[PDB]
Design a protein around this ligand. Structure first.
Ligand SMILES: [Ca+2]
Ligand SMILES: [Ca+2]
Ligand SMILES: [Ca+2]
Ligand SMILES: [Ca+2]
Length: 232
């Protein structure tokens, strides 16, 4: 044996997300022993022990377990409640002897709201709005993710609005210039999620400026949208 090879069968990454496709929930490891001429002379994946640090130091916590099928065992690395993303050094041992080291990576490709822009500067309401400006204010907004992809209410999920939920994930509050016409939203959880969208109820005929304030994490500047809600 010239040396040992730690083989990564997959992409070497573990997606911490809950809804990634295809499912990327493990790292697959094989350990070969090779001769001087580069030839595989043994699959010793079963005879080794794979461990990470005994005490967490980076918030990346994984689990190393064997998986034997038809005399063929693969070391499967799974997530064990990691709170951060990044590299985790795995140490491969034959009893007492360290053979090598491989880095697995925990990632999180979960869709976060990253960009929010307004289309028009003004919106008007009609009878079809049923006295609530939220449905039209939302339609006047464009939400993108980390990948710059549109965040949109999907019809195959009639329970909740993905676009409204994406806005509320980054919104700190909506200030009205006149609470008598439309009330200000201090608690964004009041922007309720149903097939019927509500939260910006019209209490009186009038024109008002709704200012959308976002959290410090998102770094998104305030957005001012004038809303006209005429009477009969
Ligand atoms: Ca996942
Ligand atoms: Ca993987
Ligand atoms: Ca760790
Ligand atoms: Ca839906």
């Amino acid at each position: 044996v010239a040396n040992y090879q730690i083989k990564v069968l997959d992409d070497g990454k573990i997606d911490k997300s809950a809804t990634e496709s295809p499912a990327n929930n493990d790292v697959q490891l094989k350990v070969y022993a090779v001769d001087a001429n580069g030839n595989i002379v043994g699959d010793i994946t079963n005879d080794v022990t794979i461990t990470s640090e005994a005490t967490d130091t980076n918030g990346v916590i994984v689990n190393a377990s064997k998986s034997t099928a038809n005399g063929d065992t693969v070391y499967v690395i799974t997530d064990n409640g990691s709170k951060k993303v990044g590299k985790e050094t795995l140490t491969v041992k034959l009893g007492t002897v360290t053979l090598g080291t491989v880095d697995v990576e925990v990632i999180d490709t979960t869709l976060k709201a990253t960009v929010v822009t307004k289309k028009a500067d003004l919106i008007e309401l009609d009878a079809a709005d049923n006295g609530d400006a939220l449905a039209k204010l939302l339609a006047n907004l464009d939400i993108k993710d980390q990948n710059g992809n549109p965040m949109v209410d999907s019809a195959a999920t009639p329970n909740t609005n993905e676009k409204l939920q994406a806005l509320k994930s980054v919104l700190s509050g909506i200030v009205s210039s006149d609470t008598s016409v439309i009330g200000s939203v201090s608690n964004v959880d009041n922007l309720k999620d149903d097939a019927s969208i509500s939260g910006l109820a019209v209490k009186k005929a009038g024109t008002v400026t709704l200012t959308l304030v976002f959290n410090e994490d998102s770094k998104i500047a305030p957005i001012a949208i004038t809303v006209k809600a005429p009477a009969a």
